[PDB]
Amino acid sequence: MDTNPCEKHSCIAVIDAGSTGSRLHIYSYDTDDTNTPIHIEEIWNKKIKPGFASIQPNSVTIDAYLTMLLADAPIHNIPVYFYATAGMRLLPQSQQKKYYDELDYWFRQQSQWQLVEAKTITGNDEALFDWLAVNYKLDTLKSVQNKSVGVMDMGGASVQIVFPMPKNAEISKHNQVELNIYGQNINLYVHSFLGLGQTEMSHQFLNSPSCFANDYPLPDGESGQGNAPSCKEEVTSLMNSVHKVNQQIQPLLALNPVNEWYSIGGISNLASSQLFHFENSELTNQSLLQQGDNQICHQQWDILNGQYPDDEYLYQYCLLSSYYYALMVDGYGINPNQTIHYIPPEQNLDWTIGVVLHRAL
């Protein structure tokens, strides 16, 4: 990296305004012959909590939030994209408008940041950016691939799945994207499931004793008595009986097999806990469920709590092991022994590189 990279290269700011927090990235890049970004490098990152949608939108609270997120950035005289995801999608457009009206005003009140767009993106666009960001980092975009790379993003309020699929006129145009990048033509199936992110899904199982460690105090006064296969079946009812994940996804994946799966989001944080044993930043769903069942679900809560003081989400590890299995295996139909790569959480790889690439197509 150069000293003062934005005096030597193009730079752009992209803000991921997710359900659990907002993440500013500033990227330097160069461009090739088509003015498409290459050599994308993150030169600044700042993550804040809580999520944008969780604040009361008024001039004071928006100024405080945006100052916290942006003020200390090393460079401000650059284009900014503020793209909110599933947290804002939980609100009707009428309620979201207050937020963007205050946000727009704040940007127009200052003279450095160059706001390009501030909006809530659909889960389908978020999926598209998920796939581009991961494939950029894998360096699979430059050339036509021998194998199919699928991406899953596990968020707080939505989950996305995205994989290559030729154009299919029987499938909604909203769930398909054709792009041309680096002179290659790519057709993807995209899908997002709102309500199936970890925070929203969890709020339907907090009184399920099979979903918590033994003796964990459930909110309505019963005790945990964890059993991951049992908890997973409860979560599968939400996946399939309610959202119809399997009916929508499995027929398409059967016909458009994915050779390598990469996942980003909460699953990376779970799989990185010392309660689990994984190698090479990959897991299988069978191993995740069995480890969660044995090391959390059937263990005593007060012991676990004192033993893992740094795992903030420890109380949900039995649930979350069961939930990722329910989603991937019973929902998407992925084999429980199939390798799932998870991107290390220290990489802070979200979908925002996707925006850098996609705005110039």
Q: Which amino acid is at 32?
A: D
Q: Check binding of 108 to its own copies (CB under 8 A).
A: no
Looking at beta carbons only, is 80 or 154 nearer to Mg ion?
154
Environment class of 88 (CB within 10 Å of its CB; exposed 0-12, middle 13-18, buried 19+): buried
Give buried/exposed letters for 89-102 (b at 16+ CB in 10 A, else e).
bbbeeeebeebbeb
Q: Which two tokens stand for residue 169?
A: 């006129």
Residue 307 binds its own copies (CB under 8 A):
no
| Contact between 324 and 242 (Cβ < 8 Å) | no
Pick from 61, 58, 78, 77: which is nearest to 69 by CA?
61
- Looking at residues 111 to 150 of the shown chain, list those that interact with its own copies (rule: CB under 8 A): 120, 122-124
| CB of residue 218 to its own copies, shortest distance in Å | 9
237 annotated binding-site participant: yes
Write phi, then psi, for 160 (nearest 5 degrees): -120, 155
Q: Tell whether 20 is in a known binding site.
A: yes
The residue among 18 and 331 lying less far from Mg ion, judged by its C-beta, is 18
Establish whether 317 is an annotated binding residue.
yes
Binding partner of residue 205 among Mg ion, its own copies, none, CB under 5 to 8 Å per kind?
Answer: its own copies
Reported as type and span, the H/E element at residue 266 is helix 266-271
Q: Which region among 48-56, 99-107, 111-119, 338-346 touches its own copies (by CB under 8 A)? A: 48-56
- 156 marked as binding residue: yes
**Cβ distance to its own copies smaller for residue 3 or 241:** 241
CA dihedral (205, 209, 214, 216) in degrees, to 10, reads 60
Between 76 and 98, name the residue whose CB sits nearer to its own copies.
98
Instruction: Report the partner that residue 18 touches, choosing among Mg ion, its own copies, none (CB closer than 5 to 8 A by kind).
Output: Mg ion
Least distance from C-beta 189 to Mg ion, angstroms?
Answer: 19
Instruction: Tell me the angle at which helices 285-292 and 317-325 cross, rounded to the nearest 10 degrees.
Output: 150
Residue 47 annotated in ligand binding: yes
Residues that contact Mg ion, how many (by CB under 5 A): 2
Residue 217 CA to residue 207 CA, distance in Å, equals 9
Site string for its own copies, 253-272 (x = CB under 8 A): --------------------
d(CA 89, CA 337): 34
Please identify which residue in the block is written with the tokens 């990376």: 268
161 to 190: interface string for its own copies, x by CB under 8 A:
-----------x-x----------------
User: Side by side, which strands form the sheet with 260-265?
Assistant: 176-181, 184-194, 158-164, 149-154, 260-265, 339-342, 282-284
Exposure on the CB side of residue 312, measured as CA atoms within 13 A: 2
Given its own copies, Mg ion, none, residue 155, with its beta carbon under 5 to 8 Å by kind, binds: Mg ion
Q: Which does 124 bind (CB under 5 to 8 A by kind): Mg ion, its own copies, none?
A: its own copies
94 forms part of the interface with its own copies (CB under 8 A)? yes
Task: Examine residue 109 and tell whether it contacts its own copies (CB under 8 A).
Answer: no
To the nearest 10°, report the CA torsion of 71, 76, 80, 86: -20
Does 358 engage in binding with its own copies (CB under 8 A)?
no
Question: What is the C-alpha end-to-end distance of the chain, expressed in Å?
Answer: 26
23 assigned to a ligand binding site: yes
Could you say whether residue 303 binds its own copies (CB under 8 A)? Answer: no
Restricting to residues 119-178, name those near Mg ion by CB under 5 A: 155
Binding residues (CB under 8 A) for its own copies: these are 50, 54, 56, 89-90, 92-95, 120, 122-124, 157, 172, 174, 192, 194-195, 200, 203-207, 217, 219-222, 234, 237-238, 241-243, 312, 315
Residue positions forming the annotated binding site: 6, 19-20, 23, 47, 49, 107, 110, 113, 156, 237, 241, 269, 274, 313, 317
Binding site for Mg ion (CB under 5 A): 18, 155
